[PDB]
RNA sequence: GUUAUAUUAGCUUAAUUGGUAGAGCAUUCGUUUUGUAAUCGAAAGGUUUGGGGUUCAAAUCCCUAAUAUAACAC
RNA sequence: GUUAUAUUAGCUUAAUUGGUAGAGCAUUCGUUUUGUAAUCGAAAGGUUUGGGGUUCAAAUCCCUAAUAUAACAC
């Protein structure tokens, strides 16, 4: 939070305003990061773990929330929506995507052949959290979940949760590095449904925990009102734990919505529903990212990937060399004709500091902003037609690379999420 | 509407529900189109027209909306938000992004050196439209604008507006094919600001209209309460006109929020604001596409890009050849290892219909869904190790290798075809 | 929400015990043309989060509203 | 919001200005192994958008709520 605010000020990441407490503004550099993470998650979800993104309403009539049980469970924690006409039924601004995905499931007849049916959803969610509980980006009033719900059969539940934990291991152990433990969170005192169903639901998660081999801890009575959950817990540099990813086993909402599919014996069965998020919310995940990296973004995430600095800022040969590298790496098009920007090209975040200042000043400035690479161009470089390029960390080990070597180096960096 | 509904049912695009009137559900196939359009627009805005995307709140306190003028003026159209507390100040769910973008501009000291300053915003908007004016995807209560606001100087206004017209032309004249005319929508009965400022704002748009050479007509009293505008009008197949893209010249909101920047003379000046959108709303734009194409999407947009049909659904050599092409074209990874999906690969929407049914039935099914391509595999194809591939909009067949189909689809997607 | 503590220019901050709102960084202009962590100079930016009061005088004391941070509550 | 019309199985629809809901597509299983616009068969899916009223009897008539389509209003 204090760390978040320092990095945000240095890098122009975010802003807040009392005219909308607990909602973030992502400034252009903040949104660059936000979007890259979403792009990353969407790729894994659509093209590896078999998810299908939907786009759902944000407001729903009171009746819907009464059906799902939320209007009950979270009555104060829900923002209410009204029209100028006092006769119409009131609305709720959504704090969860799941009743909407239940409406989708049950709008048409479903066949066992389309299960597991996996829906992802990146809608903004609103929760009227207690003002005293709000905190930077970790606990907000408006936030974005990398949300998904799976509809499946009893025999599918375990592999679906193991797949969900695979994606969690890819995020927290491989791409964004022991790294977490699981809270097994059981039946709360306010719950819906039969104690026998709840007991069976807890039984499943217990056996999954055992087979997974992963470290875990009982977290009594902190389950969702509709189901027990596996809560993935990360520790920040002050030894504080934070719930991010989560897998929730839900036998209750399919019952509230009377969800049905037809199986091979030509009869109707009730699906089981799995709630799941891997980032948790994009905002909280970003806060923990910053807490750990202190502004030192990996190359592929960095809103400041390289800066180019000419020793002599009014020298034509240096300038022309700097500009040409910038045009190459940004890979943009001019606004004055009609050729459109193609899909799936590379574009890198490369700036050109030609302020009339000593080189050491501009370098100092770029180090404070945590540029991944520093590219200096002087008369030596103009002769060689190579650029002098420095990584953020290794101040000593320079390289002299051509235009195309830097291009290829950067592409290789993004391919490998490095 | 009619047409939208039929096509939506055939391709499982969208869904509605009385529990949220005037909001769309995009089913997986609908959402694929939605996201591809946004993807297209973001590339143009970021790598050609110098926009920077922002993500902003959805709800703001009454006070903000009173300062912007929306509270008095767009009083009917605004959903109110409240909490259980009731001593707290009321919120409005946003019908526009503009005041959020003014808060961002005004939040920190600004220099003339960062102008033109261009924010793009794709946030969901809500307006409480009259129930009797609601219609399919053209008029909704919730919708997404490809919104943008430009902050600039007086000498920059014309070139910034010409650049917006350039993006409009790429969209309506080249990628998604006079294609439109412009409504010059002037000062409404209820407006904010000075008469003298309004007159100057209309003078500027008149001159632009002249210099642009484009067809236009007067649309009296139809401006926004904060500015006159140029409204891009397209005509549907029943000859009814629809407003899509729009360009709005705003002197008033910067005065309301007292925005300023510092110029070369170390002095404070007020920026001018241009409002713009090119699709208008993604929803209304999709609606007009469907009206135009009757569900026959161009390849790069089609949720149904190719279907693969084995003649003999239990013949192992025919299945292997179908399955191998699907894997190539879809280019997906398996969920059992730790290897992540890399950025900027190609992936195509390719299905395998192995239903134990006559070839002609499966082909009729695929034609009804308007697949761009139909790929048949029989014994002939196994011998040749080539696939029989037929276009939707055509008689003529081709026999191509796996690799040729891959490259063909990439060239179609590359050239937005 | 409650308790505590705060809110001073875009950011960070000073104002000896109510008595001069003062700097640094960033910005604008001039100057310097610079080889891997800060050329030099000037200008501008404040009525101290908003609204009331007390006093000859308020950033400082009193009432109120709003946020933020931290704990609790939930 | 007003006016008109409508709401029947996932979808499209039929049903003596009152008489006791039928089918096509899709789905599930069986059958067919199919060469470019629909193999054959069976099963399941309806208490007619919600609520109230009239009647011996309501998909049908009346009132009302919700939504959709169209036009107007804005
Ligand atoms: C996973 C969803 O489908 C499920 N219905 C759900 O909402 N679970 S949740 O309430 O526990 O939210 C999941 C994660 O969102 C994040 N989250 C929850 N509330 C907030 C908040 N107020 N601000 C920021 N992030 C939050 C946490 O990481 C949490 O683990
Ligand atoms: C362009 C924005 O920055 C500006 N503030 C604005 O809101 N202009 S607007 O009101 O005219 O909206 C622009 C476009 O959104 C689309 N739009 C407006 N209202 C709706 C609606 N109720 N449903 C669907 N699309 C809408 C139209 O295409 C319209 O041209
Ligand atoms: Zn959920
Ligand atoms: Zn606007």
Residues making up chain B, counted from first to last: 417
What is the C-alpha separation between A225 and A249, in angstroms, rounded? 11
- C1' (D71) to CA (B13) span, angstroms: 28
The alpha helices in B48-190, defined as continuous H runs, are 62-68, 70-73, 98-107, 157-169
Q: Is the peptide bond before A116 cis (omega within 30 degrees of 0)?
A: yes
Q: Resolution of this entry in Å?
A: 2.3
Smallest Cα–C1' distance to nucleotide C10: which residue has it? B108
Pocket of ligand 1 (CB under 6 A): A 96, 98, 127, 129, 139-140, 143, 145, 147, 243-244, 246, 275-277, 280-281, 283-284
Burial class (CB in 10 A: 0-12, 13-18, 19+), B359: middle
Q: Is the peptide bond before B399 cis (omega within 30 degrees of 0)?
A: no
- Return the structure tokens found at A365: 């400035």
Nearest CA to B283 out of B52, B51, B16 is that of B16
Q: Which ligand places an atom closest to the C-alpha of A102?
A: 3
User: What is the pairing mode between strands A261-262 and A110-111?
Assistant: parallel
Closest CA in chain A for residue B30: A54
CB contact under 8 A, B19 and A142: no
Cα-Cα-Cα-Cα dihedral sign, residues B107, B108, B111, B115? negative
Q: Which of the listed residues B102, B284, B286, B287 should we mutate to test ligand 2's pocket, taking the one with most ligand atoms within 8 A of CB?
A: B284
Q: Among all residues of B, which ones are annotated catalytic? A: 98, 127, 145, 147, 149, 229, 275
Angle at B383 between CA B379 and CA B388, to 5 degrees: 65
Nearest by CB to residue A59, choosing from B20, B48, B50, is B20
Note whether B143 contacts A: Cβ–Cβ < 8 A. no
Note whether A345 contacts B: Cβ–Cβ < 8 A. yes
Burial class (CB in 10 A: 0-12, 13-18, 19+), B184: buried
What is the C-alpha separation between A115 and A118, in angstroms, rounded? 8
Q: Which CATH superfamily is domain A1-294 in?
A: Bira Bifunctional Protein; Domain 2 (3.30.930.10)
Fold identical between A1-294 and A295-418?
Answer: no
Burial class (CB in 10 A: 0-12, 13-18, 19+), A407: middle
In chain B, domain spans: 1-294, 295-417
CB contact under 8 A, A25 and B75: no
From A161's Cα to the closest Cα of chain B, the distance in A is 12
Nearest by CB to residue B26, choosing from A55, A83, A417, is A55
Burial class (CB in 10 A: 0-12, 13-18, 19+), A360: exposed
Elucidation method: X-ray
One of 1.10.260.40, 1.10.3720.10, 3.40.50.800, 2.40.37.10 is the CATH number of A295-418, namely 3.40.50.800
Rounded CA Rg of chain A = 25
Q: Residue B113: CB partners within 8 Å, gap ≥ 6?
A: none
- Return the structure tokens found at B329: 């074209």
Specify whether the CB–CB gap between B225 and B69 falls below 8 A.
yes
Q: Residue B165: CB partners within 8 Å, gap ≥ 6?
A: B212, B214, B247
Q: Which of the listed residues B127, B151, B280 should we mutate to test ligand 2's pocket, taking the one with most ligand atoms within 8 A of CB?
A: B280
What is the C-alpha separation between B297 and A131, in angstroms, rounded? 48
Nearest CA to ligand 1 atom 20: A139
* Nucleic acid strand C: bases within 7 A of protein CB: 1-3, 9-12, 26-29, 31-39, 43-45, 66-74
Helix (H) or strand (E) holding B126: strand B124-126
Nearest CA to A352 out of A371, A333, A335 is that of A371
Instruction: Assign domain B295-417 to a CATH class.
Output: alpha beta
């Amino acid at each position: 939070a204090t760390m978040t605010s320092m990095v945000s000020q240095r890098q122009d990441l975010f802003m807040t305003d009392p005219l909308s407490p607990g909602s973030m503004f992502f400034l252009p550099n903040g949104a660059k990061i936000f979007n890259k993470l979403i792009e990353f998650m969407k790729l894994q979800q659509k093209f590896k773990f078999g998810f299908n993104e939907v786009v759902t309403p944000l407001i729903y009539k009171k009746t819907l929330w009464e059906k799902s049980g939320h209007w009950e469970n979270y009555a104060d924690d829900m923002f209410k929506v009204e029209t100028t006409d006092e006769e119409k039924e009131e609305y709720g601004l959504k704090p969860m995507n799941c009743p909407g995905h239940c409406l989708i499931f049950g709008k048409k007849d479903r066949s066992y052949n389309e299960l597991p049916l996996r829906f992802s959803d990146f809608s903004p969610l609103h929760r009227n959290e207690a003002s005293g509980a709000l905190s930077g980006l970790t606990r907000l009033r408006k936030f974005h979940q990398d949300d998904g719900h799976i509809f499946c059969t009893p025999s599918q539940v375990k592999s679906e949760i193991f797949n969900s934990l695979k994606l969690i291991d890819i995020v927290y152990n491989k791409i964004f590095p022991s790294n977490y433990f699981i809270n097994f969170s059981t039946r709360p005192d306010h719950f819906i449904g039969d104690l026998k169903v709840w007991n069976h639901a807890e039984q499943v998660l217990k056996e999954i925990l055992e087979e997974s081999g992963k470290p875990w801890k009982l977290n009594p009575g902190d389950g969702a009102f509709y189901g027990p959950k596996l809560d993935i817990m990360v520790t920040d540099h002050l030894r504080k734990t934070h719930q991010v990813a989560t897998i929730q086993l839900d036998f209750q909402l399919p019952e509230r919505f009377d969800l049905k599919f037809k199986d091979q014996d030509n009869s109707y069965k009730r699906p089981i529903m799995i709630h799941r998020a891997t980032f948790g919310s994009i905002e909280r995940f970003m806060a923990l990212l910053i807490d750990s990296n202190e502004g030192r973004w990996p190359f592929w995430l960095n809103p400041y990937q390289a800066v180019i600095i000419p020793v002599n800022t009014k020298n034509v040969q240096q300038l022309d060399m700097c500009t040409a590298l910038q045009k190459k790496l940004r890979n943009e098009l001019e606004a004055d004709d009609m050729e459109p920007v193609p899909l799936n090209d590379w574009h890198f975040n490369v700036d050109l500091d030609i302020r009339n200042e000593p080189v050491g000043y501009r370098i100092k400035s770029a180090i404070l902003k945590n540029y991944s690479y520093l590219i200096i161009v002087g008369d030596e470089e103009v002769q060689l037609q190579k650029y002098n390029i420095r990584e953020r960390d290794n101040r000593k080990s320079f390289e002299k690379l051509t235009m195309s070597q830097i291009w290829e180096k950067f592409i290789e960096l993004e391919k490998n999420y490095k």
